[PDB]
Design a binder for this molecule. Structure first.
Ligand SMILES: Nc1nc2c(ncn2[C@@H]2O[C@H](COP(=O)(O)OP(=O)(O)O)[C@@H](O)[C@H]2O)c(=O)[nH]1
Ligand SMILES: Nc1nc2c(ncn2[C@@H]2O[C@H](COP(=O)(O)OP(=O)(O)O)[C@@H](O)[C@H]2O)c(=O)[nH]1
Lengths: 169, 169
């Protein structure tokens, strides 16, 4: 059977939070500059070719490529639970994404590096607090331990499958 | 060197005009259902990963997936030069694309099957006439003879490279 849906997922976050590692762990299942990588999944019996982008780091200074944020059905806002300054910069990310992404794009907050408990600077409850203020889902994940990594994109694909628009005519 | 730009190209046209053959000829160089195929090209010294979509045929009846038309930096409107009824339906395609694609998307008119001169029903001048009325570039191509097939996506990528937006901050 051919693919039933194609979903363009966009990874955003400060440099060093684990964006390319989360991308490598989801598609290639490994652990340890503009490109996108694909992985085929099933969601409610439908074959969906996921399109995961890692394009936030190579943008020009004080510019945004507004075409990359368009068409993106899902945006994964990633921060480092071991870096409280990356968690405090989520407000800047959420403001830029919502301004340039479209109204039907779904935002998913993710606290990466949930395995590094020795260096944890942001609680799991702090991430659940910020996510419920921005009205977005939340998950703590780790590209190292593969914890909740699949559930990030599978849950986001399930929301897009429920929310994506198919306008008449 | 990593990729400098990523371009989402959308192929549209009536069923049977040669959309999937033009896609197969561009990426795989061969001749003789929702998916996209990629091919890496160079445009003015920049490595661009092209993303060619063939998604017009499997849409639901009297519906459009408005997310697929968003983010698409280029739309290739294809008709059959051996099928005058497919050329007369370009007005319907151009009206739908412009309504759901964004203002910075570039439209490229293409008359496929330029090799079949025995069955030609639309002149090359008719296609140049319709294209200059819609203010879009034009090319007559053939997935069979590989004529102007590369020039379709290379010219469209050159226009997007000149037109795509990089908004400040
Ligand atoms: N412990 C741990 N370290 C991680 C995780 N993800 C990334 N890292 C480390 O963070 C460093 C930089 O991450 P990176 O992929 O470059 O993030 P990016 O620059 O935002 O894409 C890498 O060297 C990884 O070793 C994780 O889930 N757990
Ligand atoms: N002579 C000729 N035939 C073509 C060309 N492109 C496609 N065809 C024929 O048109 C038929 C249907 O085209 P198809 O790829 O299904 O168009 P689509 O349904 O719009 O994607 C195929 O069986 C091809 O043999 C071309 O450039 N030249």
């Amino acid at each position: 059977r051919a693919y039933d849906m194609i979903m363009k997922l966009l990874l955003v976050g400060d440099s060093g939070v684990g964006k390319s590692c989360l991308l490598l762990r989801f598609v290639e299942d490994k652990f340890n500059g503009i490109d996108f990588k694909i992985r085929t999944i099933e969601s409610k019996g439908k074959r969906i070719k996921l399109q995961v982008w890692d394009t936030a780091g190579q943008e020009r200074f004080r510019t945004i490529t507004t075409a990359y944020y368009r068409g993106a059905m899902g945006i994964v806002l990633i921060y480092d639970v071991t870096d409280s300054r990356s968690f405090e910069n989520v407000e800047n990310w959420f403001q830029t994404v919502t301004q340039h992404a479209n109204e039907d794009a779904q935002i998913f907050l993710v606290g990466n590096k949930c395995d590094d408990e020795v260096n944890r600077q942001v609680s799991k409850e702090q991430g659940q607090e910020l996510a419920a203020k921005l009205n977005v889902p939340f998950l703590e994940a780790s590209a190292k331990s593969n914890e909740n990594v699949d559930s990030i994109f599978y849950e986001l694909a399930s929301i897009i499958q429920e929310k994506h628009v198919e306008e008449n005519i």
